[PDB]
Tab-separated table of C-alpha atoms in Angstrom:
chain	number	residue	atom	x	y	z
A	1	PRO	CA	121.617	195.463	124.547
A	2	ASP	CA	125.056	194.279	123.304
A	3	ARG	CA	124.755	196.833	120.440
A	4	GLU	CA	124.934	200.109	122.387
A	5	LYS	CA	127.653	198.434	124.506
A	6	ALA	CA	129.890	197.596	121.521
A	7	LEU	CA	129.429	201.142	120.194
A	8	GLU	CA	130.308	202.715	123.551
A	9	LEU	CA	133.325	200.413	123.714
A	10	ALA	CA	134.484	201.493	120.243
A	11	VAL	CA	133.838	205.151	121.088
A	12	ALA	CA	135.814	204.876	124.325
A	13	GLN	CA	138.817	203.346	122.467
A	14	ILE	CA	138.789	205.955	119.704
A	15	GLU	CA	138.626	208.610	122.390
A	16	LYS	CA	141.543	207.034	124.297
A	17	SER	CA	143.711	206.752	121.164
A	18	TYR	CA	142.971	210.077	119.428
A	19	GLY	CA	141.627	212.419	122.138
A	20	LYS	CA	138.274	213.425	123.588
A	21	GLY	CA	136.237	214.952	120.774
A	22	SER	CA	137.424	212.408	118.193
A	23	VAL	CA	133.801	211.269	117.782
A	24	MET	CA	130.492	212.736	118.969
A	25	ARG	CA	126.772	212.576	118.384
A	26	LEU	CA	125.463	215.938	117.172
A	27	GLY	CA	122.808	215.780	119.903
A	28	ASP	CA	125.358	215.349	122.740
A	29	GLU	CA	125.900	217.935	125.446
A	30	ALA	CA	129.384	219.368	125.823
A	31	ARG	CA	131.324	218.772	128.994
A	32	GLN	CA	132.252	222.107	130.601
A	33	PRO	CA	135.885	223.184	130.968
A	34	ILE	CA	137.196	225.094	133.986
A	35	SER	CA	137.760	228.289	132.003
A	36	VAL	CA	137.054	229.598	128.531
A	37	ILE	CA	137.345	233.001	126.856
A	38	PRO	CA	133.889	234.455	126.210
A	39	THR	CA	133.291	235.994	122.804
A	40	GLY	CA	131.081	238.952	123.627
A	41	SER	CA	127.837	237.371	122.377
A	42	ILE	CA	125.945	234.817	124.446
A	43	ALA	CA	124.525	233.395	121.180
A	44	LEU	CA	128.059	232.648	119.983
A	45	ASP	CA	129.085	231.381	123.420
A	46	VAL	CA	126.152	228.939	123.293
A	47	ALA	CA	126.864	227.877	119.698
A	48	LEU	CA	130.400	226.993	120.796
A	49	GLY	CA	128.808	224.736	123.430
A	50	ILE	CA	131.410	225.380	126.155
A	51	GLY	CA	130.415	229.062	126.693
A	52	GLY	CA	133.362	230.654	124.885
A	53	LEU	CA	136.628	229.869	123.163
A	54	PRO	CA	138.766	227.008	124.430
A	55	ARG	CA	142.195	227.577	126.001
A	56	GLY	CA	145.350	225.876	124.756
A	57	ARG	CA	143.973	225.422	121.204
A	58	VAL	CA	144.266	226.854	117.692
A	59	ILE	CA	141.220	228.770	116.403
A	60	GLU	CA	140.600	229.812	112.822
A	61	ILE	CA	138.200	232.668	112.062
A	62	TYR	CA	137.573	233.236	108.388
A	63	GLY	CA	135.261	235.036	106.023
A	64	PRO	CA	135.247	237.836	103.421
A	65	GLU	CA	136.608	241.336	103.941
A	66	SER	CA	134.396	243.443	106.269
A	67	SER	CA	132.538	240.404	107.579
A	68	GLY	CA	133.363	241.302	111.204
A	69	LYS	CA	135.917	238.576	111.809
A	70	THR	CA	138.435	241.018	113.308
A	71	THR	CA	135.779	242.424	115.633
A	72	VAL	CA	135.110	238.935	117.022
A	73	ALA	CA	138.842	238.436	117.629
A	74	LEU	CA	139.154	241.820	119.427
A	75	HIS	CA	136.319	240.987	121.858
A	76	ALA	CA	138.138	237.742	122.702
A	77	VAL	CA	141.244	239.888	123.435
A	78	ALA	CA	139.129	242.291	125.535
A	79	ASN	CA	137.618	239.490	127.653
A	80	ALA	CA	140.953	237.757	128.211
A	81	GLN	CA	142.451	241.064	129.414
A	82	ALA	CA	139.447	241.858	131.594
A	83	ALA	CA	140.165	238.643	133.508
A	84	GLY	CA	143.804	239.686	134.077
A	85	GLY	CA	145.277	237.972	130.991
A	86	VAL	CA	148.010	239.224	128.651
A	87	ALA	CA	147.396	239.510	124.908
A	88	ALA	CA	149.639	239.804	121.859
A	89	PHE	CA	148.659	240.859	118.345
A	90	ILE	CA	150.861	239.762	115.425
A	91	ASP	CA	150.132	242.083	112.557
A	92	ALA	CA	151.039	241.622	108.907
A	93	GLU	CA	148.063	243.640	107.611
A	94	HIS	CA	148.768	247.061	109.262
A	95	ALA	CA	145.017	247.634	109.488
A	96	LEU	CA	144.424	247.734	113.245
A	97	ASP	CA	142.351	250.708	114.530
A	98	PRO	CA	143.267	251.157	118.223
A	99	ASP	CA	140.522	253.704	118.913
A	100	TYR	CA	137.940	251.193	117.725
A	101	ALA	CA	139.677	248.456	119.717
A	102	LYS	CA	139.492	250.682	122.814
A	103	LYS	CA	135.722	251.144	122.491
A	104	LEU	CA	135.257	247.334	122.356
A	105	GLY	CA	137.072	247.077	125.689
A	106	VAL	CA	140.646	246.329	124.642
A	107	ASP	CA	143.406	247.653	126.858
A	108	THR	CA	145.537	248.912	123.981
A	109	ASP	CA	148.362	250.237	126.183
A	110	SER	CA	149.044	246.692	127.494
A	111	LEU	CA	148.504	245.061	124.112
A	112	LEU	CA	151.733	243.512	122.806
A	113	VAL	CA	152.179	244.143	119.091
A	114	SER	CA	154.662	242.859	116.556
A	115	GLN	CA	154.855	243.799	112.860
A	116	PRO	CA	157.232	241.252	111.425
A	117	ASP	CA	159.283	241.297	108.234
A	118	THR	CA	158.463	237.766	107.032
A	119	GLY	CA	155.950	234.960	107.468
A	120	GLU	CA	158.545	232.808	109.285
A	121	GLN	CA	159.469	235.654	111.607
A	122	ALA	CA	155.769	236.110	112.474
A	123	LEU	CA	155.271	232.463	113.424
A	124	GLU	CA	158.617	232.172	115.257
A	125	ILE	CA	157.833	235.307	117.280
A	126	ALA	CA	154.388	233.875	118.034
A	127	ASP	CA	156.094	230.668	119.151
A	128	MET	CA	158.528	232.372	121.564
A	129	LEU	CA	155.656	234.344	123.071
A	130	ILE	CA	153.586	231.214	123.660
A	131	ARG	CA	156.500	229.301	125.266
A	132	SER	CA	156.944	232.092	127.840
A	133	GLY	CA	153.772	230.797	129.508
A	134	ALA	CA	152.797	234.414	130.193
A	135	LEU	CA	150.196	234.893	127.416
A	136	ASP	CA	146.518	234.075	127.478
A	137	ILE	CA	145.910	234.781	123.815
A	138	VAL	CA	147.645	235.733	120.585
A	139	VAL	CA	145.972	236.866	117.371
A	140	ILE	CA	147.680	236.577	113.985
A	141	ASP	CA	146.313	238.983	111.371
A	142	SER	CA	146.355	237.388	108.869
A	143	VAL	CA	147.182	234.053	107.239
A	144	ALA	CA	147.161	235.422	103.646
A	145	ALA	CA	149.579	238.211	104.553
A	146	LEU	CA	152.236	235.764	105.884
A	147	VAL	CA	154.672	235.975	102.949
A	148	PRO	CA	157.645	233.560	102.972
A	149	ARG	CA	161.195	234.975	103.097
A	150	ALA	CA	162.195	233.382	99.795
A	151	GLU	CA	159.380	235.242	98.066
A	152	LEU	CA	160.281	238.584	99.700
A	153	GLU	CA	163.896	238.123	98.590
A	154	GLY	CA	162.705	237.257	95.069
A	155	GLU	CA	164.137	233.730	94.689
A	156	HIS	CA	158.527	228.878	92.241
A	157	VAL	CA	157.249	226.602	95.044
A	158	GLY	CA	153.992	226.340	97.082
A	159	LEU	CA	155.993	226.908	100.272
A	160	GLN	CA	153.586	229.118	102.246
A	161	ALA	CA	151.706	225.862	102.892
A	162	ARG	CA	154.966	224.194	104.042
A	163	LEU	CA	155.700	227.161	106.327
A	164	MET	CA	152.300	226.916	108.081
A	165	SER	CA	152.577	223.136	108.377
A	166	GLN	CA	155.971	223.199	110.091
A	167	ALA	CA	154.977	226.092	112.325
A	168	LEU	CA	151.652	224.606	113.395
A	169	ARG	CA	153.271	221.249	114.227
A	170	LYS	CA	155.740	223.005	116.557
A	171	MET	CA	153.099	225.407	117.921
A	172	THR	CA	150.347	222.918	118.874
A	173	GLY	CA	152.475	221.382	121.658
A	174	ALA	CA	153.450	224.724	123.151
A	175	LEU	CA	149.816	225.861	123.181
A	176	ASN	CA	148.579	222.823	125.083
A	177	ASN	CA	151.313	223.079	127.726
A	178	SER	CA	150.839	226.831	128.151
A	179	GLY	CA	147.040	227.176	128.150
A	180	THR	CA	147.408	229.907	125.484
A	181	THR	CA	144.770	230.365	122.790
A	182	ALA	CA	145.946	231.283	119.262
A	183	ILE	CA	143.465	232.888	116.857
A	184	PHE	CA	144.364	232.902	113.138
A	185	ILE	CA	142.422	235.268	110.924
A	186	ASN	CA	141.930	234.072	107.364
A	187	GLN	CA	140.353	235.395	104.110
A	188	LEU	CA	138.042	233.547	101.709
A	189	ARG	CA	139.347	232.378	98.297
A	190	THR	CA	147.721	228.605	100.618
A	191	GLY	CA	148.502	227.774	104.268
A	192	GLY	CA	144.839	227.446	105.244
A	193	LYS	CA	145.082	223.749	104.282
A	194	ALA	CA	147.113	222.785	107.370
A	195	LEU	CA	145.089	225.207	109.536
A	196	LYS	CA	141.909	223.348	108.613
A	197	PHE	CA	143.244	220.198	110.339
A	198	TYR	CA	145.212	221.643	113.290
A	199	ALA	CA	142.434	224.000	114.378
A	200	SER	CA	140.138	222.771	117.155
A	201	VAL	CA	137.519	225.384	116.229
A	202	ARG	CA	136.820	226.963	112.852
A	203	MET	CA	134.308	229.817	112.491
A	204	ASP	CA	132.803	231.057	109.210
A	205	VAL	CA	131.803	234.740	109.603
A	206	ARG	CA	129.423	236.564	107.191
A	207	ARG	CA	127.506	239.819	106.964
A	208	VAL	CA	123.790	238.960	106.645
A	209	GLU	CA	122.125	242.390	106.360
A	210	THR	CA	122.548	246.060	107.201
A	211	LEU	CA	120.930	247.311	110.401
A	212	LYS	CA	119.094	250.527	109.507
A	213	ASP	CA	117.588	253.179	111.765
A	214	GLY	CA	116.028	255.900	109.600
A	215	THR	CA	118.233	257.173	106.767
A	216	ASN	CA	121.520	255.926	108.295
A	217	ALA	CA	122.698	252.339	108.913
A	218	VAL	CA	123.821	251.814	112.537
A	219	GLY	CA	125.505	248.387	112.054
A	220	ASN	CA	125.331	244.857	110.645
A	221	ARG	CA	123.705	241.571	111.451
A	222	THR	CA	126.463	238.953	111.450
A	223	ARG	CA	126.173	235.163	111.173
A	224	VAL	CA	128.787	232.726	112.429
A	225	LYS	CA	128.771	229.040	111.588
A	226	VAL	CA	131.002	226.838	113.723
A	227	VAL	CA	132.004	224.448	110.932
A	228	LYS	CA	134.544	222.618	113.115
A	229	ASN	CA	134.466	222.025	116.846
A	230	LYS	CA	136.521	219.449	118.764
A	231	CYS	CA	135.116	220.569	122.133
A	232	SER	CA	131.379	220.232	121.509
A	233	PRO	CA	129.173	219.229	118.569
A	234	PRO	CA	129.932	221.232	115.411
A	235	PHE	CA	127.668	222.896	112.829
A	236	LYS	CA	125.863	225.292	115.151
A	237	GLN	CA	125.301	228.861	114.116
A	238	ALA	CA	124.689	232.184	115.828
A	239	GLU	CA	123.530	235.615	114.739
A	240	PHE	CA	124.318	238.877	116.484
A	241	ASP	CA	124.677	242.601	115.852
A	242	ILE	CA	127.866	244.558	115.316
A	243	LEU	CA	127.236	248.290	115.870
A	244	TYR	CA	129.467	250.754	114.020
A	245	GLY	CA	132.029	252.137	116.449
A	246	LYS	CA	130.732	250.031	119.390
A	247	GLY	CA	131.339	246.381	118.402
A	248	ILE	CA	129.222	243.349	119.259
A	249	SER	CA	126.015	244.300	121.054
A	250	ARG	CA	126.024	242.218	124.237
A	251	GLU	CA	122.582	243.563	125.135
A	252	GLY	CA	121.077	242.739	121.725
A	253	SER	CA	122.085	239.080	122.109
A	254	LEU	CA	120.605	238.916	125.603
A	255	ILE	CA	117.295	240.060	124.119
A	256	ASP	CA	117.399	237.590	121.146
A	257	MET	CA	118.439	234.656	123.337
A	258	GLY	CA	116.068	235.978	126.005
A	259	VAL	CA	113.002	235.653	123.766
A	260	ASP	CA	114.317	232.429	122.217
A	261	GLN	CA	114.473	230.827	125.695
A	262	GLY	CA	111.089	232.292	126.799
A	263	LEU	CA	112.635	234.388	129.617
A	264	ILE	CA	111.636	237.602	127.851
A	265	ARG	CA	108.044	237.716	126.603
A	266	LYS	CA	107.170	239.786	123.525
A	267	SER	CA	103.587	241.134	123.203
A	268	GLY	CA	104.127	242.718	119.778
A	269	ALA	CA	106.335	245.798	119.809
A	270	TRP	CA	106.635	245.446	123.618
A	271	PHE	CA	109.455	243.499	125.250
A	272	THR	CA	108.629	242.218	128.741
A	273	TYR	CA	110.668	240.628	131.496
A	274	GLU	CA	109.207	239.357	134.804
A	275	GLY	CA	106.119	241.599	134.663
A	276	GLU	CA	108.100	244.760	133.785
A	277	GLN	CA	108.513	246.482	130.437
A	278	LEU	CA	112.008	246.702	128.952
A	279	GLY	CA	110.967	248.831	126.006
A	280	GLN	CA	108.974	249.150	122.811
A	281	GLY	CA	111.083	247.930	119.879
A	282	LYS	CA	114.453	246.157	120.007
A	283	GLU	CA	116.416	249.394	120.211
A	284	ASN	CA	114.651	250.712	123.349
A	285	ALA	CA	114.888	247.328	125.038
A	286	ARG	CA	118.576	247.278	124.034
A	287	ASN	CA	119.169	250.771	125.477
A	288	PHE	CA	117.163	249.913	128.578
A	289	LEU	CA	119.537	246.987	129.173
A	290	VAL	CA	122.703	249.054	128.683
A	291	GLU	CA	121.365	251.745	131.076
A	292	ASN	CA	120.307	249.049	133.550
A	293	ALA	CA	123.423	246.883	133.929
A	294	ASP	CA	121.878	244.906	136.845
A	295	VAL	CA	118.896	243.440	134.926
A	296	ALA	CA	121.236	242.604	132.008
A	297	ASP	CA	123.409	240.596	134.392
A	298	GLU	CA	120.375	238.749	135.788
A	299	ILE	CA	119.085	237.743	132.338
A	300	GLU	CA	122.594	236.576	131.366
A	301	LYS	CA	122.880	234.383	134.487
A	302	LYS	CA	119.419	232.815	133.955
A	303	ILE	CA	120.160	231.949	130.303
A	304	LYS	CA	123.445	230.339	131.411
A	305	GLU	CA	121.685	228.308	134.140
A	306	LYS	CA	118.935	227.206	131.754
A	307	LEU	CA	121.514	225.867	129.238
A	308	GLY	CA	124.161	224.566	131.673
A	309	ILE	CA	127.043	226.900	130.878
A	310	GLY	CA	129.557	226.723	133.772
A	311	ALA	CA	132.013	229.331	135.110
Protein backbone atom coordinates (compact mmCIF):
# COMPACT_ATOMS: atom_id res chain seq x y z
CA PRO A 1 0.00 0.00 0.00
CA ASP A 2 2.58 2.58 -1.20
CA ARG A 3 4.51 1.98 2.07
CA GLU A 4 5.67 -1.62 1.57
CA LYS A 5 6.37 -0.64 -2.07
CA ALA A 6 8.70 2.25 -1.17
CA LEU A 7 10.51 0.00 1.32
CA GLU A 8 10.95 -2.79 -1.24
CA LEU A 9 12.19 -0.19 -3.71
CA ALA A 10 14.75 1.13 -1.21
CA VAL A 11 15.79 -2.42 -0.30
CA ALA A 12 16.23 -3.36 -3.95
CA GLN A 13 18.48 -0.30 -4.57
CA ILE A 14 20.62 -0.92 -1.49
CA GLU A 15 20.97 -4.52 -2.62
CA LYS A 16 21.94 -3.45 -6.16
CA SER A 17 24.54 -0.94 -4.91
CA TYR A 18 26.14 -2.88 -2.03
CA GLY A 19 25.37 -6.57 -2.67
CA LYS A 20 22.70 -9.10 -1.74
CA GLY A 21 22.70 -9.39 2.05
CA SER A 22 23.21 -5.65 2.60
CA VAL A 23 19.84 -5.55 4.40
CA MET A 24 17.53 -8.29 5.68
CA ARG A 25 14.63 -8.91 8.01
CA LEU A 26 15.62 -11.32 10.78
CA GLY A 27 12.54 -13.40 9.95
CA ASP A 28 13.49 -13.84 6.26
CA GLU A 29 14.36 -17.19 4.73
CA ALA A 30 17.77 -17.55 3.12
CA ARG A 31 18.04 -18.21 -0.57
CA GLN A 32 19.94 -21.46 -1.18
CA PRO A 33 23.30 -21.48 -2.98
CA ILE A 34 24.36 -24.24 -5.38
CA SER A 35 27.03 -25.58 -3.02
CA VAL A 36 28.20 -24.97 0.52
CA ILE A 37 30.66 -26.71 2.84
CA PRO A 38 28.80 -28.51 5.63
CA THR A 39 30.15 -28.10 9.14
CA GLY A 40 29.58 -31.52 10.64
CA SER A 41 26.57 -30.51 12.76
CA ILE A 42 23.11 -30.11 11.24
CA ALA A 43 22.29 -27.64 14.06
CA LEU A 44 25.15 -25.41 12.92
CA ASP A 45 24.26 -25.94 9.26
CA VAL A 46 20.72 -24.75 10.04
CA ALA A 47 21.90 -21.79 12.13
CA LEU A 48 23.97 -20.67 9.14
CA GLY A 49 20.73 -20.72 7.13
CA ILE A 50 22.29 -21.95 3.86
CA GLY A 51 23.15 -25.45 5.21
CA GLY A 52 26.90 -24.92 5.65
CA LEU A 53 29.69 -22.45 5.05
CA PRO A 54 29.59 -20.24 1.97
CA ARG A 55 32.15 -20.56 -0.84
CA GLY A 56 34.24 -17.64 -2.07
CA ARG A 57 34.03 -15.78 1.28
CA VAL A 58 36.08 -14.97 4.37
CA ILE A 59 34.98 -16.68 7.61
CA GLU A 60 36.13 -15.78 11.10
CA ILE A 61 35.85 -18.33 13.91
CA TYR A 62 36.79 -17.01 17.31
CA GLY A 63 36.56 -17.84 20.98
CA PRO A 64 38.76 -18.70 23.98
CA GLU A 65 41.44 -21.38 24.06
CA SER A 66 39.97 -24.93 24.09
CA SER A 67 36.54 -23.73 22.99
CA GLY A 68 36.51 -26.14 20.02
CA LYS A 69 37.03 -23.56 17.30
CA THR A 70 39.80 -25.59 15.65
CA THR A 71 37.62 -28.70 15.68
CA VAL A 72 34.91 -26.85 13.74
CA ALA A 73 37.49 -25.72 11.17
CA LEU A 74 38.85 -29.28 10.75
CA HIS A 75 35.38 -30.72 10.02
CA ALA A 76 34.97 -28.06 7.31
CA VAL A 77 38.32 -29.28 5.86
CA ALA A 78 37.14 -32.92 6.12
CA ASN A 79 33.86 -32.24 4.28
CA ALA A 80 35.51 -30.21 1.53
CA GLN A 81 37.99 -33.06 0.94
CA ALA A 82 35.27 -35.71 1.05
CA ALA A 83 33.65 -33.96 -1.92
CA GLY A 84 36.93 -34.06 -3.89
CA GLY A 85 38.24 -30.63 -2.81
CA VAL A 86 41.81 -29.61 -1.96
CA ALA A 87 42.64 -28.02 1.40
CA ALA A 88 45.56 -26.00 2.73
CA PHE A 89 46.40 -25.25 6.36
CA ILE A 90 48.55 -22.19 7.14
CA ASP A 91 50.02 -22.73 10.56
CA ALA A 92 51.68 -20.16 12.81
CA GLU A 93 50.69 -21.92 16.05
CA HIS A 94 52.44 -25.33 15.55
CA ALA A 95 49.62 -26.97 17.51
CA LEU A 96 48.01 -29.22 14.89
CA ASP A 97 47.41 -32.86 15.97
CA PRO A 98 47.20 -34.93 12.75
CA ASP A 99 46.04 -38.10 14.49
CA TYR A 100 43.08 -36.20 15.90
CA ALA A 101 42.49 -34.58 12.51
CA LYS A 102 42.47 -38.06 10.93
CA LYS A 103 39.75 -39.33 13.28
CA LEU A 104 37.53 -36.35 12.34
CA GLY A 105 37.81 -37.40 8.69
CA VAL A 106 40.66 -35.23 7.41
CA ASP A 107 42.85 -36.69 4.70
CA THR A 108 46.10 -35.56 6.29
CA ASP A 109 48.35 -36.98 3.55
CA SER A 110 46.72 -34.66 0.96
CA LEU A 111 46.54 -31.71 3.34
CA LEU A 112 48.79 -28.87 2.17
CA VAL A 113 50.64 -27.27 5.07
CA SER A 114 52.81 -24.19 5.35
CA GLN A 115 54.60 -22.92 8.47
CA PRO A 116 55.70 -19.45 7.50
CA ASP A 117 58.39 -17.20 8.97
CA THR A 118 56.35 -13.98 9.13
CA GLY A 119 52.78 -12.68 9.13
CA GLU A 120 53.24 -11.20 5.63
CA GLN A 121 54.67 -14.44 4.30
CA ALA A 122 51.63 -16.32 5.68
CA LEU A 123 49.11 -14.05 3.95
CA GLU A 124 51.09 -13.85 0.69
CA ILE A 125 51.38 -17.65 0.57
CA ALA A 126 47.65 -17.88 1.27
CA ASP A 127 47.08 -15.44 -1.58
CA MET A 128 49.13 -17.39 -4.16
CA LEU A 129 47.32 -20.58 -3.19
CA ILE A 130 43.90 -18.98 -3.64
CA ARG A 131 44.80 -17.48 -7.06
CA SER A 132 45.73 -20.96 -8.36
CA GLY A 133 42.00 -21.71 -8.48
CA ALA A 134 42.80 -25.23 -7.28
CA LEU A 135 41.81 -24.88 -3.59
CA ASP A 136 38.41 -25.30 -2.02
CA ILE A 137 39.43 -24.09 1.41
CA VAL A 138 42.32 -22.64 3.38
CA VAL A 139 42.55 -22.31 7.15
CA ILE A 140 44.85 -19.79 8.83
CA ASP A 141 45.77 -20.70 12.41
CA SER A 142 45.80 -18.09 13.81
CA VAL A 143 45.32 -14.33 13.53
CA ALA A 144 47.12 -13.51 16.83
CA ALA A 145 50.17 -15.53 15.82
CA LEU A 146 50.68 -13.54 12.57
CA VAL A 147 53.68 -11.45 13.69
CA PRO A 148 54.88 -8.70 11.31
CA ARG A 149 58.41 -8.88 9.86
CA ALA A 150 59.47 -5.57 11.40
CA GLU A 151 58.66 -6.93 14.84
CA LEU A 152 60.54 -10.21 14.23
CA GLU A 153 63.58 -8.23 13.08
CA GLY A 154 63.30 -6.00 16.17
CA GLU A 155 62.82 -2.58 14.52
CA HIS A 156 56.64 1.00 17.69
CA VAL A 157 53.59 0.96 15.38
CA GLY A 158 50.19 -0.84 15.37
CA LEU A 159 51.08 -2.42 12.02
CA GLN A 160 49.61 -5.92 12.47
CA ALA A 161 46.27 -4.20 11.82
CA ARG A 162 47.71 -2.55 8.67
CA LEU A 163 49.06 -5.93 7.50
CA MET A 164 45.64 -7.63 7.80
CA SER A 165 43.89 -4.69 6.13
CA GLN A 166 46.12 -4.69 3.06
CA ALA A 167 46.05 -8.47 2.80
CA LEU A 168 42.29 -8.80 3.17
CA ARG A 169 41.66 -6.10 0.54
CA LYS A 170 43.80 -8.04 -1.97
CA MET A 171 42.43 -11.43 -0.86
CA THR A 172 38.67 -10.74 -1.04
CA GLY A 173 38.74 -10.39 -4.84
CA ALA A 174 40.72 -13.57 -5.38
CA LEU A 175 38.34 -15.53 -3.14
CA ASN A 176 35.23 -14.47 -5.03
CA ASN A 177 36.73 -15.30 -8.43
CA SER A 178 38.08 -18.65 -7.25
CA GLY A 179 35.19 -20.01 -5.17
CA THR A 180 37.68 -20.66 -2.33
CA THR A 181 36.63 -20.34 1.30
CA ALA A 182 39.15 -18.86 3.78
CA ILE A 183 38.70 -19.57 7.50
CA PHE A 184 40.61 -17.35 9.96
CA ILE A 185 40.92 -18.61 13.51
CA ASN A 186 41.05 -15.90 16.15
CA GLN A 187 41.46 -15.67 19.97
CA LEU A 188 39.43 -13.57 22.43
CA ARG A 189 40.98 -10.45 24.03
CA THR A 190 45.13 -6.30 16.60
CA GLY A 191 44.20 -7.36 13.05
CA GLY A 192 40.77 -8.66 14.06
CA LYS A 193 39.43 -5.13 13.43
CA ALA A 194 39.62 -5.43 9.63
CA LEU A 195 38.50 -9.08 9.80
CA LYS A 196 35.30 -8.01 11.53
CA PHE A 197 34.27 -6.04 8.41
CA TYR A 198 35.64 -8.20 5.57
CA ALA A 199 34.23 -11.45 6.95
CA SER A 200 30.89 -12.60 5.54
CA VAL A 201 30.36 -14.93 8.51
CA ARG A 202 31.65 -14.60 12.06
CA MET A 203 31.15 -17.39 14.61
CA ASP A 204 31.59 -17.06 18.39
CA VAL A 205 32.49 -20.49 19.85
CA ARG A 206 32.24 -21.34 23.60
CA ARG A 207 32.38 -24.36 25.87
CA VAL A 208 29.05 -24.56 27.75
CA GLU A 209 29.50 -27.62 30.00
CA THR A 210 31.41 -30.87 30.37
CA LEU A 211 29.71 -34.03 29.12
CA LYS A 212 30.11 -36.64 31.87
CA ASP A 213 29.50 -40.39 31.77
CA GLY A 214 30.28 -41.85 35.21
CA THR A 215 33.59 -40.73 36.73
CA ASN A 216 35.14 -39.62 33.40
CA ALA A 217 34.11 -36.75 31.09
CA VAL A 218 33.61 -37.94 27.48
CA GLY A 219 33.42 -34.47 25.82
CA ASN A 220 31.97 -30.96 25.82
CA ARG A 221 28.76 -29.22 24.91
CA THR A 222 29.69 -26.35 22.59
CA ARG A 223 27.66 -23.26 21.67
CA VAL A 224 28.16 -21.25 18.50
CA LYS A 225 26.58 -17.86 17.92
CA VAL A 226 26.61 -16.61 14.34
CA VAL A 227 27.11 -12.93 15.20
CA LYS A 228 27.57 -11.91 11.55
CA ASN A 229 26.03 -13.45 8.46
CA LYS A 230 25.80 -11.83 5.01
CA CYS A 231 24.16 -14.92 3.47
CA SER A 232 21.17 -15.38 5.78
CA PRO A 233 19.82 -13.64 8.88
CA PRO A 234 22.42 -13.34 11.66
CA PHE A 235 22.24 -13.93 15.42
CA LYS A 236 21.24 -17.59 15.34
CA GLN A 237 22.89 -20.05 17.66
CA ALA A 238 23.51 -23.78 17.76
CA GLU A 239 24.62 -26.27 20.39
CA PHE A 240 26.33 -29.58 19.72
CA ASP A 241 28.67 -32.11 21.30
CA ILE A 242 32.39 -32.48 20.74
CA LEU A 243 33.57 -35.93 21.90
CA TYR A 244 37.18 -36.28 23.04
CA GLY A 245 39.17 -37.95 20.28
CA LYS A 246 36.15 -38.20 17.92
CA GLY A 247 35.13 -34.59 17.14
CA ILE A 248 31.64 -33.23 16.53
CA SER A 249 28.96 -35.85 17.10
CA ARG A 250 26.93 -35.89 13.88
CA GLU A 251 24.53 -38.41 15.41
CA GLY A 252 23.98 -36.37 18.59
CA SER A 253 22.85 -33.37 16.52
CA LEU A 254 20.47 -35.52 14.49
CA ILE A 255 18.84 -36.58 17.75
CA ASP A 256 18.63 -32.99 19.19
CA MET A 257 17.32 -31.52 15.93
CA GLY A 258 15.22 -34.67 15.51
CA VAL A 259 13.29 -34.09 18.74
CA ASP A 260 13.23 -30.32 18.19
CA GLN A 261 11.46 -30.85 14.83
CA GLY A 262 9.11 -33.57 16.21
CA LEU A 263 10.51 -36.30 13.91
CA ILE A 264 11.86 -38.21 16.90
CA ARG A 265 9.41 -38.65 19.78
CA LYS A 266 10.71 -38.91 23.35
CA SER A 267 8.59 -40.83 25.92
CA GLY A 268 10.89 -40.12 28.87
CA ALA A 269 14.20 -41.97 28.75
CA TRP A 270 13.06 -43.63 25.48
CA PHE A 271 13.86 -42.15 22.08
CA THR A 272 11.45 -43.22 19.33
CA TYR A 273 11.44 -42.83 15.57
CA GLU A 274 8.58 -43.99 13.29
CA GLY A 275 7.25 -46.58 15.76
CA GLU A 276 10.70 -48.08 16.50
CA GLN A 277 12.94 -47.55 19.51
CA LEU A 278 16.35 -45.95 18.95
CA GLY A 279 17.49 -46.37 22.52
CA GLN A 280 17.05 -45.49 26.17
CA GLY A 281 19.07 -42.36 26.97
CA LYS A 282 20.87 -40.06 24.53
CA GLU A 283 24.00 -42.19 24.45
CA ASN A 284 22.25 -45.41 23.35
CA ALA A 285 20.22 -43.55 20.75
CA ARG A 286 23.49 -41.93 19.61
CA ASN A 287 25.25 -45.31 19.36
CA PHE A 288 22.23 -46.85 17.67
CA LEU A 289 22.50 -44.16 14.98
CA VAL A 290 26.24 -44.65 14.43
CA GLU A 291 25.75 -48.45 14.16
CA ASN A 292 22.77 -47.91 11.84
CA ALA A 293 24.09 -45.50 9.20
CA ASP A 294 20.94 -45.91 7.03
CA VAL A 295 18.40 -44.57 9.58
CA ALA A 296 20.80 -41.69 10.38
CA ASP A 297 20.80 -40.74 6.70
CA GLU A 298 16.99 -40.87 6.55
CA ILE A 299 16.54 -38.59 9.58
CA GLU A 300 19.10 -36.15 8.13
CA LYS A 301 17.25 -35.98 4.79
CA LYS A 302 13.84 -35.43 6.46
CA ILE A 303 15.16 -32.58 8.65
CA LYS A 304 16.67 -30.96 5.54
CA GLU A 305 13.37 -31.29 3.61
CA LYS A 306 11.36 -29.92 6.53
CA LEU A 307 13.57 -26.78 6.72
CA GLY A 308 14.29 -26.29 2.99
CA ILE A 309 18.03 -26.91 2.92
CA GLY A 310 19.06 -27.60 -0.71
CA ALA A 311 21.92 -29.69 -2.14
